[PDB]
A paper describes a structure:
The [name] holoenzyme is composed of a hexameric AAA+ (ATPases Associated with diverse cellular Activities) unfoldase ([name]) and a tetradecameric serine protease consisting of two heptameric rings ([name]). Together, the [name] complex acts to unfold and degrade protein substrates (Baker and Sauer, 2012). [name] uses energy released by ATP hydrolysis to create a pulling force that unravels folded protein domains for translocation into the degradation chamber of [name]. Here, we present cryo-EM structures of the [name] holoenzyme from the gram-negative pathogen [name] engaged with a protein substrate.
Further local refinement and classification in cryoSPARC improved the density for [name] and revealed two distinct conformations, at 3.3 Å and 2.9 Å resolution, hereafter referred to as Conformations A and B, respectively. The main differences between Conformations A and B are within the protomer that adopts the bridging seam position, and where the seam is located relative to [name]. In Conformation A, protomer X1 is disengaged from substrate and in the seam position while in Conformation B protomer X6 is disengaged from substrate and in the seam position. However, these two seam positions are not equivalent: in Conformation A the seam is further from the apical surface of [name] in what we designate as the ‘upper seam’ (US) position (F - dark blue), while in Conformation B, the seam is closer to [name] in the ‘lower seam’ (LS) position (F - yellow). In Conformation A, the X1 pore-1 loop in the US orientation is disengaged, with the X2 protomer at the top of the spiral. In both Conformations A and B of [name], there is clear density for most of the IGF loops that extend from the [name] ring toward the apical surface of [name]. In Conformation A, clear density is observed for only five of the six IGF loops, with weak density belonging to the IGF loop of the X6 protomer (white dotted line in Figure 2B left). The lack of density for the IGF loop belonging to protomer X6 in Conformation A is likely due to conformational flexibility and sub-stoichiometric binding of this IGF loop into the [name]-binding pocket. In Conformation A, there is strong density for ATP and a magnesium cofactor in protomers X2, X3, X4, and X5, while the X1 and X6 protomers are ADP loaded, with no density for either the γ-phosphate or magnesium. In Conformation A, both the X1 and X6 protomers adopt conformations that allow the X1 protomer to move away from the pore in the US position and there is reduced surface area buried between X1 and its neighboring protomers X2 and X6. In agreement with this finding, the local resolution in the cryo-EM maps suggests that the X1 protomer in the US position is significantly more flexible than the other protomers.
Residue numbers in the entry:
A (entry chain S), B (entry chain R), D (entry chain J), F (entry chain Q), I (entry chain P), J (entry chain O): 6 to 15, 18 to 198
C (entry chain K): 6 to 198
E (entry chain I): 6 to 16, 18 to 198
G (entry chain H): 6 to 15, 19 to 198
H (entry chain M): 6 to 12, 20 to 198
Amino acid sequence: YLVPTVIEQSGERAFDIYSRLLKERIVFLVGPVTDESANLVVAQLLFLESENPDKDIFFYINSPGGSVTAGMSIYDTMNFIKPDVSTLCLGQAASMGAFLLSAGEKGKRFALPNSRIMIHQPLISGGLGGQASDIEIHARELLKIKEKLNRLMAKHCDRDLADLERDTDRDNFMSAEEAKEYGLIDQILEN
Amino acid sequence: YLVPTVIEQSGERAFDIYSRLLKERIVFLVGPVTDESANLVVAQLLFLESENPDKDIFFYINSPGGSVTAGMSIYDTMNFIKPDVSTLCLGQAASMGAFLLSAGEKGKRFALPNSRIMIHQPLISGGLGGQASDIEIHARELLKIKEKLNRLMAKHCDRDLADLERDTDRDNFMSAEEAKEYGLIDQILEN
Amino acid sequence: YLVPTVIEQSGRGERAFDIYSRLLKERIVFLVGPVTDESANLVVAQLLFLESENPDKDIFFYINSPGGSVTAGMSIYDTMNFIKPDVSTLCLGQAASMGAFLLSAGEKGKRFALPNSRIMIHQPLISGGLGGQASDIEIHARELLKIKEKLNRLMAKHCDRDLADLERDTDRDNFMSAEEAKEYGLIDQILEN
Amino acid sequence: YLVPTVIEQSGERAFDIYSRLLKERIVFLVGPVTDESANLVVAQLLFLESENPDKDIFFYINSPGGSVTAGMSIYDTMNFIKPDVSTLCLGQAASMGAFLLSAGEKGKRFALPNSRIMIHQPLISGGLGGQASDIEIHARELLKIKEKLNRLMAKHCDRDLADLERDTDRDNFMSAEEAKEYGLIDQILEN
Amino acid sequence: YLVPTVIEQSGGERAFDIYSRLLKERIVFLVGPVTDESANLVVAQLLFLESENPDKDIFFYINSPGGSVTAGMSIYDTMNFIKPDVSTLCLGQAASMGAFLLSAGEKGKRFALPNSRIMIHQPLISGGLGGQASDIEIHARELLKIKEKLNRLMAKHCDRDLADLERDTDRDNFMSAEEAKEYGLIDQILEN
Amino acid sequence: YLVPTVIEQSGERAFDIYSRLLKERIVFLVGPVTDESANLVVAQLLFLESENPDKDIFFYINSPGGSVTAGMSIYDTMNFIKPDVSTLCLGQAASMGAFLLSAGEKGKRFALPNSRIMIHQPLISGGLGGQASDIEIHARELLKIKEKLNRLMAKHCDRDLADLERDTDRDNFMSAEEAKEYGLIDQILEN
Amino acid sequence: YLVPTVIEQSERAFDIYSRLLKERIVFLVGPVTDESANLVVAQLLFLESENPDKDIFFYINSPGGSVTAGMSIYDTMNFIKPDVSTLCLGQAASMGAFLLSAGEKGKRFALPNSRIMIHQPLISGGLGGQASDIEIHARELLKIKEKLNRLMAKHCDRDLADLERDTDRDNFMSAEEAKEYGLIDQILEN
Amino acid sequence: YLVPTVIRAFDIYSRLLKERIVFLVGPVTDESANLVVAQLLFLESENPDKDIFFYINSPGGSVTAGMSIYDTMNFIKPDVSTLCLGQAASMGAFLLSAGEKGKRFALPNSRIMIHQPLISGGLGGQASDIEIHARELLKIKEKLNRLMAKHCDRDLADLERDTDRDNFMSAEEAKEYGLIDQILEN
Amino acid sequence: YLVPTVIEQSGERAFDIYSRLLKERIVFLVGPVTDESANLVVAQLLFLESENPDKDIFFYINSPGGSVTAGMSIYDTMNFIKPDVSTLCLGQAASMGAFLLSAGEKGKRFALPNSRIMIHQPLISGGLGGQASDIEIHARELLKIKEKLNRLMAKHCDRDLADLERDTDRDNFMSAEEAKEYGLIDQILEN
Amino acid sequence: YLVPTVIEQSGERAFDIYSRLLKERIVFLVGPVTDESANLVVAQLLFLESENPDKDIFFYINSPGGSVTAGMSIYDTMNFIKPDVSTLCLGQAASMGAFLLSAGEKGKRFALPNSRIMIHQPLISGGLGGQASDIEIHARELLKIKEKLNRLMAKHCDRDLADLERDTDRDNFMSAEEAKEYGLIDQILEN
């Protein structure tokens, strides 16, 4: 894709439109969460903290999910850095995208009216081949991740761990209103 | 493709021709609607609101359709931002392209005389594999999307939900005149 | 594979069979591997043939199958229930999915499993793809749910259990030993010697 | 697959089990309807008429559908030959399989209790490439086939053509009881 | 596919595959595409049947989408050469060379079943047209000669003008059994 | 390909050679007509109108054809914008390329002496799969497009619709002289 | 394909091609390959043994094939004592036309709508390797080209110069044109 | 392969079946396992008292397929003697050890390998599905070690150590371990 | 490939080496003639005419051939523009490359001593599939192109059309001396 | 690969390292000889002649061979331009690479001590398919090229044509010392 160039008035500085929005403390997570796309989010979050530790960071999420470890690098960076990270769901926040949406600062988690939010237990975090001993190890690691994600989700949503265990058993699709009632987001934007 | 470079008189500034048209508040949606192409539209819509919240934005659509969630990120951005988003159909506006065309500000939805506008119920928003329980969930989510799109279309067109349910059952191709009579567009441009 | 040839002794002469035709002569029908239109129709052809050879004698239906098509399995199932002779079922190796269904479909009191066999029951997967328009996907989703309910209902009947029990237990792949299948109600006895 | 061999008592004659059942006037249509599988059915129907024109022929159907022209070769052979062709649905009779099921002699069309019968308008009878003139021709031929199949179905079922046009619009799945009520079969066998 | 075996009663018993049994009754099937191999089997059967009985009719059952022109012409010339009349019957479909061979049956003995589909059209590629413009010219000329030959023989079969077949074979011309009868491709439509 | 850089004397400005020719109001349509290549032509046509609404735009066409909807986006832009769009055929103008050639301002449609111009009815505007009902819809849409293109061609050429229907039935190749006599172009350039 | 079985009264059950071989009919159908050519040779040798005096009927429906494979048939036809009559069904192209013309003079036939095509050979094998290897293979192909034109000219009672012109590019002939050319002697009708 | 005919005319494997010799050659599949079962059933009837000779040259295969053989061997009345030719690995070693105690043989240069099972089927889907398949694989692992330990007259703890990774044994080591009873020479 | 950068003394201007040679009025046609490579030649020829209509343009050809329509866009541009286009054969000028070589201004067509020039009738200008009617049309168009190319070649070479028809029947390879004697080039350069 | 950037002291000018070495009149031929890689060498040779017709050009060769026509474009350019072209073998000079090495100015052809020089008759200059008449033509053209290359090699090496015909029959590998004794190079560099 061709990324448009925009001019900032200050003299003038030419930006690509995403660098221009980063200047406004807007970080996008678009598409699958990968090591590379997650590390760019982390780099942007770290950079924005240095620019101004007190101002909010706006983390716009339009993602079907992705790697758990990659999503956790974002998650821990969001919680670590001093400035509040506000999260906004555009289009969809599914799987780790929903996790990172719910991970925003409480009171500053938003969704657009027709966005779709989906929460579910993790799938393969990696293949389970090799010997039964190797398969046992990877099955145990996946269960620990499953419990960790449900526990952190339950914390984000102010719900019991038992509720998240039921609700993430199979793909649980929610409207913005249902996500608000559930506790994944705080507000729904209109204008 | 090689994107031409044009010179803006002000000193001089060299733009690619799409960045030059963005300076005139023209945003293009060309080809399939994807997370990446939809997020560029959103980034441009957000940027243009900041530049001037009062001036109209011109959203030129030549698209066969694409992802619903990606199209909804555009749709909610169009409705959220203060400036009116005028929509123009070039070549075709099909599926989510027709939805976004109809989503323009009422009275400012345009089509060119020989453009083709097609509305239809959604197809797979994602595969339906796994167990019958998973297939049930995805079938239910697709039906909710189907109803949401028909409901929003009916609102755009000032028609009954029952009319959109009939008319989107199978691919419904319309000339610019038929789209105007239907309520998808307001005017047809000639000169 | 090369299927061995065996000689059946009759009066002053010998008939040469492949070993599976020889076992069919003893009223043994094998369902081995996936259930397909072709493998299911051979079972049906054998069941029909055996009923006529002797409507009163039991038929022995040996099952070693991971599952397969529901409609193909239902052609066997309805043939088993229709024909006059009792169809005894035996699980060798495994009876999974429609293989477990056909195992449980044997004549009550004559459903067997070998001691180390594995029996697995679960809700059906795709009976066919769900593409096309949302209207087509709705239709296929509804048909799959009707099949799901039909299979759980027939399973519950076979096992003398409540439909609610089969709905829980077939939600995800439910693996059972021969003893667990006997306690569940899928089989009646476990053979040893 | 290995087709078992069975011995007929008469001296003795060794048959494959399908030739043995043909001796009992049982003809199987299993799997897709193709030129080759349809011509075997025709060859068997012809052969059985010569053996005994007065005795019924039993046509066992377990088929997802197939070619219309191939199915029509069976259909016309069934109607032409003197002996009644009784039809039985095993597992499924879908598309042309349902057509041939309904084409059995009225009063002798059977289904097993858990069989599945599906009727629908035809899909591509052949690709529609080439020039718009060629596409027009193939579209017209497909519509003529569509009307012919609905008309013959309506005749088989003692229903109005308008009913079959509604009901074959999209895949219409029926239980044996629903097929009996519809008019596709006459009886449901149990024992 | 498994081809069933049937038993013929005679003076003893003989076991046939069902197609060899029908050949014994002078029924020759052309099913599926016309290829060198499928066409040569038809020719071998036509030659064999002439020798068995030169006076009795041969019944040539056609269910074919078309195929090679040269392969179809080997059948066509064999049909016309051998003494016994070759009656033709359309089952399912007779398209392209299948329709040609259907129309090539003995006049008065060309049949179709009521719901059969008969399609006539000009030939497509009889072979690729690559190489040099000189080679392409040659193959284009050969294809046009074949086109004219097929329309001329069709017009003869149908008792129509060559000009009519040239119009009607320009694009795929689908006909019901009734339309094929009116056109002149078949003589009768069977019902019972 | 490496696109040469040329220097414009004014100070100096370095252009790629196509941006340099755009500065002279020359727009190229080279190769297949796609959404992307058509939208660049539209962007250039819109840009040139803004630069000078009165001066002619020179639209150089060397194209085998392409998408109808993409070509129609160019076509409607050509007719909409105030400045005359002169069209020149280089090498070939086939299918939608011939349509856009004939769409130039009457009296300003040119071809080079050895160019090749080919007009024909459209092929598939999209596949015709699915159910016979879907195939009927797409066949009807293709016929409407066929009629629309012949009608607009007949208007461009000052011919009867009946003439274009004959002449576009199969690929109709024309020399520049034959295209001039037909009415697709007005003049043939030599020097 | 399923090859029908027929019963010969004498009973003996044959596949229909073995039944026609009993009548001294040998088929060459499809491409000429080492395997299909060797079956023709085996049948020609067998038939000479059964009766050295009776004609053999060699039915040809072939687009062409290998030259060496076709030459094994050709030399067998010329060697064995009984005349080999040749008939063109459908088509006789390339080596198929060569073998058609190779039939006994006066006994080369074609059916009325058959197509006969003669042309210079294409690659008898690839020409890779070094320029020295390419030179060798080019020379061998030219020798084959000359040999085929020379034998064709002999079959047709024409000058070598005529075959060199006429085989330059694919030369398609009707049965009548092949008869006038000299590839066949008669055209059968009934 | 062309299977020789020996003199009624038998193929050489049907001829050896007449001598109560059943071959398991190559991978254990549903189809190859069911032929062994069909042959074992057939031989029991031809003579319930005479030994059956089960010649094994197999790298392993499906557990469920191997268990159909295993249960048939234990069920039928006649003793099933087992002989290792070339190799008996994985389920092939299991079926070798499953022969009648005192009648399990190996040829001198044969190779016998025992190991825990690998995937009995893929582990995709949701973590809940992966948990189920991991549990089923562990139950199979324990069942195989338990039956192996019974065959070998060893503790379950010994088989759990020794099957952790591919454990290759000579015929002598397999005899000392308890997988076979004797080694044939002449 | 990495295209070297060279510095022009004037201040200094950095060019890629091909843009530097374009500044000297040298246009390269290297490799196959395609719509894209032909349009760059046309763009360069048009540009150079504007820079100086009187000075010669040097068109260096090292090409195996390519599309006829693409080559004709170059050919007509060469003949149209006022400045003489001198042509030089480097390595090879085959098929349309030989045509464009011979198309240079008479007296200014050059070849290097060990260059190879090959002339031949065209091959497929496009596939010949579809119906015999479509194949007839494409065969006729190819023959018209064949005659046009031989006629223009004969004009370039001052030979009879009959000579070019013989000589282009099969690939006709010529040394620079043979091409000079034939009439394809005027001179052979040495130093 | 990332091509390093180096700074030239003059103010400062940043070059990629190959453009920097071109400034020193060093032209590299690395890897296979293709139309594109050969034309860059030609462009560089032409450029360097213009910069200084009298100074030597250093042509560094590390090439396994390639196209003959492409190599001949270099060869004729080397011989045409006024400045001597010195050639140096690095790593290897095989096939046309050895030809171009031997083509350097007599007395200025160099090789590094452990370089490998291989001479051989050409392979396929293009495939030999089609008809025996086409194969004859291509075989004749290949033989003419073979003779031309041996003749030019013999001239370069001051040997008889008969010697090169023997020695190029099969791949003839030479050390730098053997190439010097043969006559392919004049000197071997050490320090």
